[PDB]
Design a protein around this ligand. Structure first.
Ligand SMILES: COC(=O)C[C@](O)(CCCC(C)(C)O)C(=O)O[C@@H]1C(OC)=C[C@]23CCCN2CCc2cc4c(cc2[C@H]13)OCO4
Ligand SMILES: [Mg+2]
Ligand SMILES: [Mg+2]
Ligand SMILES: [Mg+2]
Ligand SMILES: [Mg+2]
Ligand SMILES: [Mg+2]
Ligand SMILES: [Mg+2]
Ligand SMILES: [Mg+2]
Ligand SMILES: [Mg+2]
Ligand SMILES: [Mg+2]
Ligand SMILES: [Mg+2]
Ligand SMILES: [Mg+2]
Ligand SMILES: [Mg+2]
Ligand SMILES: [Mg+2]
Ligand SMILES: [Mg+2]
Ligand SMILES: [Mg+2]
Ligand SMILES: [Mg+2]
Lengths: 252, 201, 175, 139, 190, 109
RNA sequence: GGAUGAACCGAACGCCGGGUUAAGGCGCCCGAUGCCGACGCUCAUCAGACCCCAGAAAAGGUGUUGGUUGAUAUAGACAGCA
RNA sequence: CAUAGCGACGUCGCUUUUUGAUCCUUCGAUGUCGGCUCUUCCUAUCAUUGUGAAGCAGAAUUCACCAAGCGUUGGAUUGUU
RNA sequence: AGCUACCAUCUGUGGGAUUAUGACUGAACGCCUCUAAGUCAGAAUCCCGCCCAGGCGGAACGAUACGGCAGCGCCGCGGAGCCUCGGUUGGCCUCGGAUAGCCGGUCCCCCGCCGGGGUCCGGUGCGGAGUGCCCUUCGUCCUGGGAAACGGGGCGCGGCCGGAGAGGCGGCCGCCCCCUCGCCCGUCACGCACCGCACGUUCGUGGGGAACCUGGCGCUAAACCAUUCGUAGACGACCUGCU
């Protein structure tokens, strides 16, 4: 029979795999739609949740009760040391989807960046990218690099830059830098490839990507709660006190 | 046959070509189908779209993850259609099913090779001209396939390069006919032999 | 009654002689049957319907095929018949173009079955006659009265679809 | 668009059926599907024939419809269909197919040798013409 | 019943020529060029003479449904001839009870903006079909002049304008406001 | 020097919908797609050639991995050029869709 | 054989080889029409697809195909415009 | 003013959300009302999105179509449905 | 501190084909007509995006094991051999497309000397034809006539170009070494001719796995446990740090 009264469903079906994230960082999964008309600009950045506080400002919203008034709004502090772009990835469009065409890593990879490649940095020989960086010196290696750049120029559709954070600027225990692919938008493929090449081994301060009083999107992994029952996991109704085999359950 | 049979899906009907392919793979033959987005389906487009939406509605109510895997790519759709005509729950069916390869567009392993066309599945001869038909590429595009534009662009590039190859082959054939014209006093002895036995009208 | 390629039969029969009439009258009918046995059966059925005769009560004295007197001449056939539809009995007049009368009757049977779902047992053919082109009333037949008839074969369907089953060239339907 | 028509006096070629490989002349038209068909000189007595086994030609005779065998035969013999047809590319292609099919093993061997030598000479000439056409350099 | 042959011949004036590429009809008149193909109808098109330019539409062995297509093609060809020779001018009159309809003819007549339809604050932005020029009549206070070569495009733009000013949630019989086509006419009146 | 036998495919056993006669088998001779063309191949010896793990004796040669199941085509099947073959031993079902040779040994021409 | 089914259709049974069939079938599953099968009807934005049998009635359609009856008409029908 | 909205006389259907009829399964046991909780589904749609009609001036209302995405509640009485 | 509450606070999104319906052109049916052909708009519906998970599904890149005899990679088709898995028995190296139309060639216009157009000439039951094309294996020895001799062979080296949708491929130069041999018609004899018999004839130096020797060219690392962390947590797993 029908349930005697209708009620909205508990929880969302858009987040059904209620599981621990397979990644600790939090991936983008969709970069903003690129157009060659805009100037070259990065589309993403990395930050660390420093803390929260509140501010006092005056609102300039006509027609509102709080127009030209003082409000107190909570804010969140996100420490963002400048990113260091250390590589370029070019992607090519296929009927099977986007796939990695060619990857070029810059010379002199930062020491904290090299820590990401090792599960045990303490026991490592620190051999990561040692033979790779030697091809930035020999003429045959530079010819190979230029050929890769030309292939990316004439074949790739979208390109992304590898950037890493700076643990030495942060008060965390972890010295392992955070790697990320960041999409480069706003121009022809050759223009953005050259622009990325001029920013290899360089620092990209957060102001160059995001500006004042603009609205952005935040991607992250929520606080872990461990194993939780239906009362907290789905905010279901608690059964009455008289219930025998438990009141923090779903009855049917 | 022993070689790989390459079939062009353009202008071919779904059921007929699928039945022919399923009969072919059962005979221990390797079949590759390219440009599956060019497959036509009889009946007007709205009816076939309704059919595919009805297929979409059929899902396991308890757990849609275990449910019927609705494939959206035109090549994958044709692959599922062929799988419907085979005993794919048996080892023989799976072995036959592994002999079939389907692709959207024409891949580089096959774009430099000639493509067969099945008369018994062509829309031009198996459908009355006054009827309406539905393209597999458009139907897939409006139901959840995502790569129609890039497929069209790659097919455009392949058409450009194929036109270049065709012009080269026309130049070669013109030069061959010219060469046939240049030498015939040293050719007529064999020409009469060939013309005597039917070859070279 | 099934079908095939029908044949005209001039069937002549009569009652058995009785010590009331020593010379019963003869009756002659034209019956279109796949074989002479079916012709005799339909003759008995029709004489039972019209006159007061039975197959046992009478006899058949002649049963031969009626060959077409001009099978090399195109001619117009007018056919009168009655048939039992799903909701009663109706009378029809149909027209056909054929060289043979029996072929015209077969064409009529196939046409009635195709258009009205009329099975052969339900159809009573009552009059078959050659008619002039001036007496034709069906436009589908009258449109063939052209001393200068001319038309192409517009869209020729490929019939040899399996020899070959696989080929490189797409077929041409223009001829 | 259409160059070949079905009409009285049109010569049609029999594709398949009992009379395959024969030339006939259309006498009259029946029910959109059949036609009165007569080959008086190609040994095809008057008979009905479906359109599906016909392939039309470009020879059209001039006799009244439903005429007897005599006038059709005279129209066939005058402006001889046989000799003109035999000179057409269609008839000689059919003849070439027939003689290719009936070719024996010895004939196959001789044809293979002749085609070998012919193709080698043709390819040599093609290479000569390519190298003669490759010496091009002009602003 | 399949009719053996159904044909109709359309005469072409001397100032305009028609070129056929299969079933694609190219009509080039003094007012411009109109091109329209009929690949979806399996008919035969041919030009008859070099003197009077007769165009014939032929359909062989057609049932009842497809026989209607011949005269449809003939009417479309005549409409194209009329457009390339005289053109199509549609006159639409805007009617209103209380709120006058302000019409702004934007760049090149390709965009039409309606301000005070039923007094609502919304602005209706309707873009004309390419090749169709809209304008405000200089002889009438409330009249829109739509000019173009193709009848379908012009009448489609007129229908878009007419449906744009549609009264909603009201008895449309009493509220008769909107822009409606007064007459379908020609340019150059020849 | 030459292939010297016609290519044929073990299509399957003579069978109904729910019954399988394994003592006889159906073959598909390549290029023969009509019943009237099957006359030439009737009575011809047909062999199934495969390899195995252990060496077997070879007539007129050294032992090798080649094994043969002999048979001969009995009569035509269907109307699409199918033929029926009776073998000395019933064909293993793993040979379905594999090569069968028509050896031309009983020449009638 | 009817996918499947105690009763339906065919046909009743020792174990095998060959041949021929019943009822039923012959696009693929799955043996057989890979016949250059014959004639016509039918487009369905819930088409249709075979006894028992597993889904439908009355009433309609200016969709289309036939057929019956009647009527008008170069003494100009019919339809449009006046 | 038959048919905006209804429909007497008659008449044809659909549903298994009522109640009947039967006893085919279950008698070496399928826990029997109701309430709570919770999920999904149906549409013969109450509202909402988009429309058509009215005896639709506006408002309000009714009739009808595409339509089941979203929602359809808090309490006094009664074990109650 | 931590956990926590519309008991505090913040955030919640874009597009496509379209139903109903309203229209356009327009016959059917010299009128009409949203429909027959062809068109337009169109929504809490549908689908996709955003979002969540990520295939017995893929991509690119990194570094790839010693200070001792010690492992590994590549290069040689280098050798002698083993074990195992068997299929197969010439290749075709590619226009786009239409079917009430196509295909080829050529003289004039316009785009980088090649293409797009307008003429003209041909073919069309496709013969510039997949019912098709190429190659075709008995081999050697005299031995002439033709084809060619601006020719082929190089697992011969070096160089270049094109191919990115899965490029795993293809093409072109320079140098060096061969033979004037291979292609057709002829002459001349020879080869185990194994005495009628089957699995013969290829891909093929096939795929995979251990192992020996033979040379050259190069490399010397991670992961996990333990411990530490607490952005994590039932345990695992997860985020960390460790001269
Ligand atoms: C007197 O009321 C009853 O009969 C209920 C009960 O006694 C319940 C006993 C269940 C236990 C667990 C004790 O076996 C019982 O025997 O259930 C039966 C029960 O035993 C399991 C059988 C029925 C028969 C089919 C299903 N089972 C469903 C419950 C039921 C409900 C009834 C009923 C009979 C059944 C039976 O009459 C009126 O309402
Ligand atoms: Mg409810
Ligand atoms: Mg209790
Ligand atoms: Mg049974
Ligand atoms: Mg059944
Ligand atoms: Mg038996
Ligand atoms: Mg069956
Ligand atoms: Mg079969
Ligand atoms: Mg129990
Ligand atoms: Mg229970
Ligand atoms: Mg409903
Ligand atoms: Mg109101
Ligand atoms: Mg929902
Ligand atoms: Mg809250
Ligand atoms: Mg009009
Ligand atoms: Mg509509
Ligand atoms: Mg639209």
């Amino acid at each position: 029979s029908h349930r005697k009264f209708s009620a909205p469903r508990h929880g969302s079906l858009g987040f059904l795999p209620r599981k621990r994230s397979s990644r600790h960082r939090g991936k983008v999964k969709s970069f903003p739609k690129d157009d060659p008309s805009k100037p070259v600009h990065l589309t993403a950045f990395l930050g660390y949740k420093a803390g929260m506080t509140h501010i006092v400002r005056e609102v300039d919203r006509p027609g509102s009760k709080v127009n030209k008034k003082e409000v107190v709004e909570a804010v969140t502090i996100v420490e963002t040391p400048p990113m260091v772009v250390v590589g370029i990835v070019g992607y090519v469009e296929t009927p099977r989807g986007l796939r990695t065409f060619k990857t070029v890593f810059a010379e002199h990879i930062s020491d904290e960046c090299k820590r990401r490649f090792y599960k045990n940095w303490h026991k490592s020989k620190k051999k990561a990218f040692t033979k790779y960086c030697k091809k930035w010196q020999d003429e045959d290696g530079k010819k190979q690099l230029e050929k890769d750049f030309s292939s990316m120029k004439k074949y790739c559709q979208v390109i992304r830059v590898i950037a890493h954070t700076q643990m030495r600027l942060l008060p965390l225990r972890q010295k392992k830098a955070h790697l990320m692919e960041i999409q480069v938008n706003g121009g022809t493929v050759a223009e953005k490839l050259d622009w990325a090449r001029e920013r290899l081994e360089q620092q990209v301060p957060v102001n160059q990507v995001f500006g004042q009083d603009e609205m952005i999107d935040v991607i992250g992994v929520t606080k872990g709660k461990g194993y939780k029952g239906v009362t907290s996991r789905w905010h279901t109704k608690k059964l009455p006190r008289k219930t025998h085999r438990g009141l923090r359950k779903v009855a049917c | 046959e022993v070689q790989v049979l390459v079939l062009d899906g353009r202008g071919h009907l779904l059921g007929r070509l699928a039945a022919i392919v399923a009969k072919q793979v059962l005979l221990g033959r390797k079949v590759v189908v390219v440009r599956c987005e060019g497959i036509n389906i009889s009946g007007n487009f709205y009816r076939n779209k309704l059919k595919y939406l009805a297929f979409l509605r059929k899902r396991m109510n308890t757990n849609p993850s275990r449910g019927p895997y609705h494939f959206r790519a035109p090549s994958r759709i044709f692959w599922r259609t062929v799988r419907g005509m085979l005993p794919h729950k048996t080892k023989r069916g799976q072995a036959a099913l592994d002999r079939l390869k389907v692709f959207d567009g024409i891949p580089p392993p096959y774009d430099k090779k000639k493509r067969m066309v099945v008369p018994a599945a062509l829309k031009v001869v198996r459908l009355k001209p006054t009827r309406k038909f539905a393209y597999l590429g458009r139907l897939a595009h409006e139901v959840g396939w995502k790569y129609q534009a890039v497929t069209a662009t790659l097919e455009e590039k392949r058409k450009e390069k194929a036109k270049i190859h065709y012009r080269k082959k026309k130049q070669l054939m013109r030069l061959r006919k010219q060469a046939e014209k240049n030498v015939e006093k040293k050719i007529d002895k064999y020409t009469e032999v060939l013309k005597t036995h039917g070859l070279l009208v | 009654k099934a079908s095939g390629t029908l044949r005209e039969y001039k069937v002549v029969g009569r009652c058995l002689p009785t010590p009331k009439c020593h010379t019963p009258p003869l009756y002659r009918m034209r019956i279109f049957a796949p074989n002479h046995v079916v012709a005799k059966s339909r003759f008995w059925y029709f004489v039972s319907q019209l006159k007061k005769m039975k197959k046992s009560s009478g006899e058949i004295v002649y049963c031969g095929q009626v060959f077409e007197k001009s099978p090399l001449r195109v001619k117009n056939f007018g056919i009168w018949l009655r048939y039992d539809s799903r909701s009663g009995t109706h009378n029809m007049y149909r027209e056909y173009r054929d060289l043979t009368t029996a072929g015209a009757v077969t064409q009529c049977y196939r046409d009635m079955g195709a258009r009205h779902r009329a099975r052969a047992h339900s159809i009573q053919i009552m009059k078959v006659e050659e008619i002039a082109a001036s007496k034709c009333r069906r436009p589908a037949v009258k449109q063939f009265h052209d001393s200068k008839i001319k038309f192409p074969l517009p869209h020729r369907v490929l019939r040899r679809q399996h020899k070959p089953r696989f080929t490189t060239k797409r077929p041409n339907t223009f001829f | 668009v259409f160059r070949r028509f079905v009409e009285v006096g049109r010569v049609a070629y029999v594709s398949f059926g009992p009379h395959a490989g024969k030339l006939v002349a259309i006498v009259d038209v029946i029910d959109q599907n059949r036609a009165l068909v007569d080959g008086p000189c190609t040994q095809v007595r008057r008979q009905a024939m479906p359109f599906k086994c016909m392939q039309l030609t470009d020879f059209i005779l001039k006799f009244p419809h439903s005429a007897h065998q005599k006038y059709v035969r005279q129209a066939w013999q005058k402006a001889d269909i046989n000799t003109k047809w035999a000179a057409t590319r269609w008839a000689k292609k059919i003849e070439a197919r027939e003689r290719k099919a009936k070719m024996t093993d010895f004939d196959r061997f001789k044809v293979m040798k002749a085609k070998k030598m012919r193709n080698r000479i043709i390819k040599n000439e093609v290479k000569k013409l390519q190298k003669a056409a490759l010496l091009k350099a002009s602003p | 019943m399949k009719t053996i042959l159904s044909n109709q011949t359309v005469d072409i004036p001397e100032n305009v020529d028609i070129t056929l590429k299969g079933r694609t009809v190219i009509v080039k008149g003094p007012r411009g060029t109109l091109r329209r193909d009929f690949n979806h109808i399996n008919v035969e098109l041919s030009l008859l003479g070099k003197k009077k330019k007769r165009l014939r539409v032929d359909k062989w062995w057609g049932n009842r449904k497809e026989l209607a297509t011949v005269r449809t093609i003939c009417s479309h060809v005549q409409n194209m001839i009329k457009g390339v020779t005289l053109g199509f001018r549609y006159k639409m009159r805007s009617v209103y009870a209380h709120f006058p309809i302000n019409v702004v003819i934007q760049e090149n007549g390709s965009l039409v903006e309606i301000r005070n339809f039923l007094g609502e604050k919304y602005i209706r932005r309707v873009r004309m079909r390419p090749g169709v020029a809209c304008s405000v009549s200089q002889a009438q206070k409330d009249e829109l002049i739509l000019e173009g070569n193709d009848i379908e495009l012009v009448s489609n733009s007129a229908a878009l304008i007419q449906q744009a000013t549609t009264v909603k949630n009201k008895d449309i019989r009493k509220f008769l406001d909107g822009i409606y086509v007064s007459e379908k006419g020609t340019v150059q009146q020849a | 020097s030459g292939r010297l036998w016609s290519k044929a495919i073990f299509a399957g056993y003579k069978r109904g919908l729910r019954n399988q006669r394994e003592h006889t088998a159906l073959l598909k001779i390549e290029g023969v797609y009509a019943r009237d063309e099957t006359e030439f191949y009737l009575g011809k010896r047909c062999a199934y050639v495969y390899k195995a793990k252990n060496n077997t004796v070879t007539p007129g040669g050294k032992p090798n991995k080649t094994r043969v199941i002999w048979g001969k085509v009995t009569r035509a099947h269907g109307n699409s050029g199918m033929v029926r073959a009776k073998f000395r031993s019933n064909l293993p079902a793993k040979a379905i869709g594999h090569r069968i040779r028509v050896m031309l040994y009983p020449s009638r021409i």
